[PDB]
Design a protein around this ligand. Structure first.
Ligand code: FSC
Ligand code: FSC
Lengths: 5, 231, 231, 5
């Protein structure tokens, strides 16, 4: 997974 | 003190006590509370932080389970795999319900009340986010439509953010972060993802160079993803 | 695969996914499952770790809320205090229910099946622990009886642990840790607490000196509390 | 509060 906000 | 004022205070208590389902319910009341006006910046933020945490837990549970299921099926052990998936189904039903409650609230109240670029990009982003959470576990035709919905919401959000908000704006910066993650993880298109991420990051640095802890963190995420995806 | 075998596997999944209410339910099934025999060491441990986490969350929420309520009432702000306490009530009802489910399970199945010093001290300790969790928030006559119940359970647990288990045994070591915390925090008797803590720690070191990561951690807690209480 | 197990 990747970074999200 | 007004009722709305109470629910808000209550939601901030729910947050401190870390009971997000309740924090959601309180902000959900304040939401359906006013009709003419829209939630304040604080209220709008409490509503998504609340949902974010509610969905985030099932998402974490889903990953763990999913990861285990993978290890087990490639181990040949099938008796376990059936229990892992039986458990995953349960986690997925909750994700579906959670996503459904906030998506309906977005169409019925949230979006119709956005009276500015700030809130319109904000609510449109949430819309994409939750159709994205669906897309993460869905597979067949369900995945395709969750994906289509995500793309539509993000594009609609981008049109407004690109014209009405600064490149340094955190909502716009977060929209880029998520939208690019959507390309990389659901559409498996690292090319479109990196372009977007890089472009949003660059425009921010540019604006910053010529003419917010808030935006600085989001930019750090955009960068961590860029370097991360370059592997 | 047996049904009991499935619930156990499921509970270990619930634990990984961190859905403790469910982990509790699964071990609760395995518990009511067998009648003649008692839960294995692994099963017995999964059941309390599950409850421990379920009660632990409300306990953390309770402290936060309680701490806030204190700050607010001493601020004179009363409109908030009524909402803080209204929220606390809710947290407390859950604590009551949680404590009730495990206490009933202890009397109906758990304790009657303990066929050794190991499990008897284990279940008797849990009994005290949950009457203690009650005592933490109760106040009037409710507190007095939760306290009396705690003391009875711990003393009964101690009699068996003192004679049947080694001073280095983690169950016995944990019983001392908790029992001494009971004296210090519910009975406000730092004297009786320090004696017990010190005595259990010393006997462990003694045995260790003459004739387990498990017990080493518990001992470190006994020491941290001893130094902590010496202030 | 104090440490318990
Ligand atoms: C205290 C709790 C609440 C009220 C929720 O505030 C949390 C945070 O709320 C604001 O931050 C928002 C915000 C977050 C920031 C990125 C947090 O950054 C830092 C450095 O703390 C996290 C939240 O999820 C939130 C509300 C969400 C979003 C997200 C919205 O999706 C629809 C995409 C963009 C981003 C915007 C709205 C951020 O402005 C503030 O700008 C933050 O900054 C400050 C001053 O510390 C504060 O920590
Ligand atoms: C993996 C999960 C399960 C199955 C729950 O195991 C967790 C743990 O279960 C065992 O530890 C127990 C145990 C705990 C240990 C103190 C953990 O210590 C370390 C170093 O990990 C924490 C749990 O709450 C548990 C089950 C509880 C108690 C408690 C019982 O109250 C009625 C008082 C004493 C203590 C005993 C039963 C401990 O033996 C083991 O001895 C532990 O040690 C090892 C080898 O790492 C393991 O981490």
């Amino acid at each position: 997974q990747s970074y999200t906000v | 003190p007004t009722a709305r004022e109470e629910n808000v205070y209550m939601a901030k208590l729910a947050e401190q006590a870390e009971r997000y389902e309740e924090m959601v319910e309180f902000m959900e009341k304040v939401s359906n509370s006013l009709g003419s006006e829209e939630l304040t910046v604080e209220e709008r933020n409490l509503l998504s932080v609340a949902y974010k945490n509610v969905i985030g837990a099932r998402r974490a549970s889903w990953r763990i389970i999913s990861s285990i299921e993978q290890k087990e099926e490639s181990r040949g052990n099938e008796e376990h795999v059936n229990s892992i998936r039986e458990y995953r189904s349960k986690i997925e039903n909750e994700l579906s319900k959670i996503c459904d409650g906030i998506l309906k609230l977005l169409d019925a109240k949230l979006i119709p009340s956005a009276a500015s670029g700030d809130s319109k990009v904000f609510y449109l982003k949430m819309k994409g986010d939750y159709h994205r959470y669906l897309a993460e576990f869905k597979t067949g035709a369900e995945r395709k439509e969750a994906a289509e919905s995500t793309l539509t919401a993000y594009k609609a959000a981008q049109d407004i953010a690109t014209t009405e908000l600064a490149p340094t704006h955190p909502i716009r910066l977060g929209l880029a972060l998520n939208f690019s993650v959507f390309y990389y993880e659901i559409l498996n298109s690292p090319d479109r993802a990196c372009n977007l991420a890089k472009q949003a990051f660059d425009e921010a640095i540019a604006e910053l160079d010529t003419l917010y802890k808030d935006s600085t963190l989001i930019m750090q995420l955009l960068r961590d993803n860029l370097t991360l995806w370059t592997s």
